[PDB]
């Protein structure tokens, strides 16, 4: 059928996306409490740490798809890639990342996340060093639209194809229905070299979340649907794990039932 | 001794626990070395019990970060009221407290139990039951009827004895005195400056007995300890800052026998 209408709806909804509210909702306590090892925060970081610790995900360039105003998803990644590209649809998010990159006081504080990352990586690294290296290795912050066949546009900056892709809470959050999800996945897959790796994190069975005034509509997806999409796009699924959201972390910022983590390798 | 009446806690913290000495990112610094010594010692599991006393805490708490998960009742002590107040400010999370969070973070890093630094500080604050005056020059350093559970299962002391003793003999006695607070078979973790003769604390200029590792070893033996461990950190040029003339730092793990 037609993809344009659904996309138009999504673009419109995101015009009201408030980064600060989003940050507060998902990365300040209770959800941003990294002290309880059973929490979603530590689980996400652990998934990323453990994956990179295999040494099997490495290369020169990495692209983060739909970064929004967050960097946690790159904390463990940055020691394995010399060149990192962050991306987002919204200017306001790219500016938010801009604040952090200039190490401004007005910037969101990720130090709890950096420290926890250092803690679990177990190399005795101090968090200031981890942050310094991430800031060094982020070579650009670019506009992206995953609904386009060329999500970064034509003749874009990013070194293509990338050795690896990271994406957290983007695809299912910007896709009206499963078919759109699949196409978005196909689009970003063109950015990844054959044999390259994708680390995908996302919400399970979620239909809405809040970003301030904006209450955005999300395609609820299951683990099996995520698996099948990955196979459909030419990936071998190396890892796919599920975190079930504890009642006490279900706070009304959304209706998320769980979180998935996928480590997939593009077939080459 | 009267020199200690001029001792400024803020200037002491600044001189010794703020950059460069207080930058914990470089693992070859004195800070990480000290924390590692304490962490490794407690990780053996051989230093345990219910009560522990920190001798001459001053306004610092780093020396207890790794200890606190092994002792449910902790007594901190200093000779100066201003230091006990400074401790109070951190223990009670009052305004103007010193920021020890980097040290807590690094202890969690080193201990490698995946513990968040806030839980660590929470536990330390919880287990420190009392902050008492003390004078290691007195045969009973805590006095007659102290609220501290005696005898303790374990002792910690860092940069106190050598810093309050005019000479080697005073050092030995101070050590004898504090040893009377320790239950036989108990443990002492002693940290100190090597070959230091002075250090500054704001307007205060303190005199230190310069001691060597062998002199430290011999004193412990004379006080009736079996030295389980004695290590030395040689002070790098870049940490020689004009606040003192320390040449190295020693760490001793001794068991009263
Ligand atoms: N068409 C599109 N293509 C790519 N990203 C889009 C998009 N439309 C919206 N987005 C971005 O989708 C993001 C989802 S929020 C996820 C933020 C972050 N990656 C996390 O891990 O918390 C928003 O930042 C939003 O700006
Ligand atoms: N007679 C005495 N008995 C016990 N402590 C004394 C003392 N005279 C001075 N002190 C204390 O000795 C401390 C030395 S500074 C050491 C502080 C801390 N333990 C550290 O690891 O940094 C000072 O706080 C000082 O008040
Ligand atoms: N959209 C979205 N971002 C999120 C970040 C964390 C969690 Cl638990 C759920 C989320 N859902
Ligand atoms: N009292 C005292 N604390 C110190 C911490 C570090 C060094 Cl190098 C010397 C010290 N001397």
Swiss-Prot record, chain B:
Assigned keywords, A-Z: Catecholamine biosynthesis, Methyltransferase, Phosphoprotein, S-adenosyl-L-methionine, Transferase
Modulation of this protein's activity: Inhibited by methyl methanethiosulfonate, phenylglyoxal, tetranitromethane and diethyl pyrocarbonate. Inhibited by 4-oxo-1,4-dihydro-quinoline-3,7-dicarboxylic acid, 4-(benzo[d][1,3]dioxol-5-ylamino)-4-oxobutanoic acid and 1,4-diaminonaphthalene-2,6-disulfonic acid.
EC code: 2.1.1.28
GO MF annotations in UniProt: phenylethanolamine N-methyltransferase activity
Effect of residue 75 to A: Significant decrease in protein expression and enzyme activity with octopamine as substrate
Sequence positions that bind S-adenosyl-L-methionine: 12, 17, 56-57, 62, 78, 83, 135-136, 158
Reaction equation(s) it catalyzes: phenylethanolamine + S-adenosyl-L-methionine = N-methylphenylethanolamine + S-adenosyl-L-homocysteine + H(+); (R)-noradrenaline + S-adenosyl-L-methionine = (R)-adrenaline + S-adenosyl-L-homocysteine + H(+); (R)-normetanephrine + S-adenosyl-L-methionine = (R)-metanephrine + S-adenosyl-L-homocysteine + H(+); (R)-octopamine + S-adenosyl-L-methionine = (R)-synephrine + S-adenosyl-L-homocysteine + H(+)
PANTHER family: NNMT/PNMT/TEMT FAMILY MEMBER (PTHR10867), PHENYLETHANOLAMINE N-METHYLTRANSFERASE (PTHR10867:SF18)
Protein family (similarity comment): Belongs to the class I-like SAM-binding methyltransferase superfamily. NNMT/PNMT/TEMT family.
Name of the protein: Phenylethanolamine N-methyltransferase
Lineage of the species this protein comes from: Eukaryota, Metazoa, Chordata, Craniata, Vertebrata
């Amino acid at each position: 059928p037609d993809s344009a209408p659904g996309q138009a709806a999504v673009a419109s909804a995101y015009q009201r996306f408030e980064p600060r509210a989003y940050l507060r909702n998902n990365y300040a306590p209770p959800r941003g409490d990294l002290c309880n090892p059973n929490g979603v925060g530590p689980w996400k970081l652990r998934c990323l740490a453990q994956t990179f610790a295999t040494g099997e995900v490495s290369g020169r360039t990495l692209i983060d798809i739909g970064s929004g105003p967050t960097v946690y998803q790159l904390l463990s990644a940055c020691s394995h890639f010399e060149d990192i590209t962050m991306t987002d649809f919204l200017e306001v998010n790219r500016q938010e990342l801009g604040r952090w990159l200039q190490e401004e006081p007005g910037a969101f504080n990720w130090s709890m996340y950096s420290q926890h990352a250092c803690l679990i990586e177990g190399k005795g690294e101090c968090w200031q060093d981890k942050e310094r290296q991430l800031r060094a290795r982020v070579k650009r912050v670019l506009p992206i639209d995953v609904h386009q066949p060329q999500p970064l546009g034509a003749g874009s900056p990013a070194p293509l194809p990338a050795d690896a892709l990271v994406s957290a809470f983007c695809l299912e959050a910007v896709s009206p229905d499963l078919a759109s999800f699949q196409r978005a996945l196909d689009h970003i897959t063109t950015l990844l070299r054959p044999g390259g790796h994708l680390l995908l994190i996302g919400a399970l069975e979620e239909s809405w979340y809040l970003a301030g005034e904006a209450r955005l509509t999300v395609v609820p997806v299951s683990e099996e649907e995520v698996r099948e999409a990955l196979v459909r796009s030419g990936y071998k699924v190396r890892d796919l794990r599920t975190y079930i959201m504890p009642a006490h972390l279900q706070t009304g910022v959304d209706d998320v039932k769980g979180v998935f983590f996928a480590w997939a390798q593009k077939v080459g």
